[PDB]
């Protein structure tokens, strides 16, 4: 089976540079044009760049032309995207994508899993975790505030509590930091007797918090 695996994504400042890699397997890499496509969080798909099978022809969307560079190593079956002259608007998941034999007027198949590039002036840091404090049903939760960059994971009771949990997409605040809420509905009669803990892990900052939420 054909597999495409991107690496190299992460946080970078405007005025920095970043190199993405895509490792290809399961096909004769040098016989095929390759491409990059990106997707800003919550937005649609935007074509980025093309490279012919032997690397002799390259094409760039006007949005990245003069700033990004595409290249390929056919001996190592790798495709690259060099990102320079960066803008915050370059924040996106970047997808490696397999083309056909000639590079023009291709469709894209298959796609890599994607790698998230965050272009921002903000610096890495872990969240503060605040309680959303609570014979019927009650709601409680955790406010995972002021972290950067994405992503964060949230579980409840070390994974023992899954029913009724909603963990919301983060919002990007005007500060440049992210904020997310995770909630769960539980029996009102349990609020003072059952222990409810939200397990927050922010890998980019190596920050983990276990927060009990009580009335």
């Amino acid at each position: 089976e054909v597999q495409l695996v991107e690496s190299g994504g992460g946080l970078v400042q405007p005025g920095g540079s970043l190199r993405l890699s895509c490792s290809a397997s399961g096909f004769t890499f040098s016989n095929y044009a390759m491409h990059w496509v990106r997707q800003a969080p919550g937005k649609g798909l935007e074509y980025v760049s093309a490279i012919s099978g032997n690397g002799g022809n390259t094409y760039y969307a006007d949005s990245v032309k003069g700033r990004f560079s595409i290249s390929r190593d056919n001996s190592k079956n790798t495709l690259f995207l060099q990102m320079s002259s960066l803008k915050t608007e370059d924040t996106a998941v970047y997808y490696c994508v397999k083309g056909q034999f000639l590079e023009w007027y291709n469709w894209f198949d298959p796609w890599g899993q994607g790698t998230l590039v965050t272009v921002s002036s903000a610096s890495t840091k872990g969240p503060s975790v605040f309680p959303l404090a609570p014979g019927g049903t009650a709601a409680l939760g955790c406010l995972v505030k002021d972290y950067f960059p994405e992503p964060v994971t949230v579980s409840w009771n070390s994974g023992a509590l899954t029913s009724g949990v909603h963990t919301f997409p983060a919002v990007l605040q005007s500060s440049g930091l992210y904020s997310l809420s995770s909630v769960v509905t539980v029996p009102s009669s349990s609020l003072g007797t059952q222990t409810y803990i939200c397990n927050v892990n922010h890998k980019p900052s190596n920050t983990k918090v276990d927060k009990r939420v009580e009335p």
């Binding site: 649609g44 935007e46 291709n106 469709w107 198949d109 605040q173 809420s181 909630v183």
Partner: protein
């Protein structure tokens, strides 16, 4: 540059019924059109190429049709996995362009949200900011309006919200809205209220607390 326009923006379909998605190109691209499926948090995958050829491994219930400027993706009996976002892409012009996507969601009966309001914690107040959170839990359809009032003053520009993906079990949505105030501002006022408008509610519901 060929402009691709998909319609509708969101298609609500009962499980087992047919879904028909439209894609229009601003010029003729013959049969040079592809369709992609993207499930939340996943990469897109190819469904259709050459307007009507199904990619390997794609179920038979997906079929593409059309030529020239008008194309159709037909999903003949929506299975649970099939609810996703669908993009078209012309494979004819040398700036490749995509449609903006059609979201296919499960249609179910109207369900009113349960609404909860959360004051800021004393811990957060110690650092000088107050977040007030309003939760709209397990409602359908997705359209809902949250209005924040602080001592009856409608808050505009002070809040952000987001919405979960459609729930796999009950096909509902949930929404969280955060109102941000400084500590000094939070302590100037007493009544904090979120008012929720939704098709499932005969009149707007308000949840509030006094600081």
């Amino acid at each position: 540059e060929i402009v691709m326009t998909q319609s509708p923006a969101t298609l609500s379909v009962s499980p087992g019924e047919r879904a028909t998605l439209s894609c229009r190109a601003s010029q003729s691209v013959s049969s040079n059109l592809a369709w992609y499926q993207q499930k939340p948090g996943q990469a897109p995958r190819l469904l259709i190429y050459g307007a009507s050829t199904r990619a390997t491994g794609i179920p038979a219930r997906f079929s593409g049709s059309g030529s020239g400027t008008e194309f159709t993706l037909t999903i003949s009996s929506l299975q649970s996995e099939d609810f996703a976002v669908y993009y078209c892409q012309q494979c004819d012009n040398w700036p490749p362009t995509f449609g903006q996507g059609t979201k296919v969601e499960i249609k179910r009966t109207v369900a009113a949200p349960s609404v909860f309001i959360f004051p800021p914690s004393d811990e957060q107040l110690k650092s000088g900011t107050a977040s007030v959170v309003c939760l709209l839990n397990n409602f359908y359809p997705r359209e809902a309006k949250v209005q924040w009032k602080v001592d009856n003053a409608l808050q505009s520009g002070n809040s952000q919200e987001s919405v979960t993906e459609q729930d796999s079990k009950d096909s509902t949505y949930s929404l969280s809205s955060t109102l941000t105030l400084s500590k000094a501002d939070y302590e100037k006022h007493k009544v904090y209220a979120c008012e929720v408008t939704h098709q499932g509610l005969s009149s707007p519901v308000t949840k509030s607390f006094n600081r």
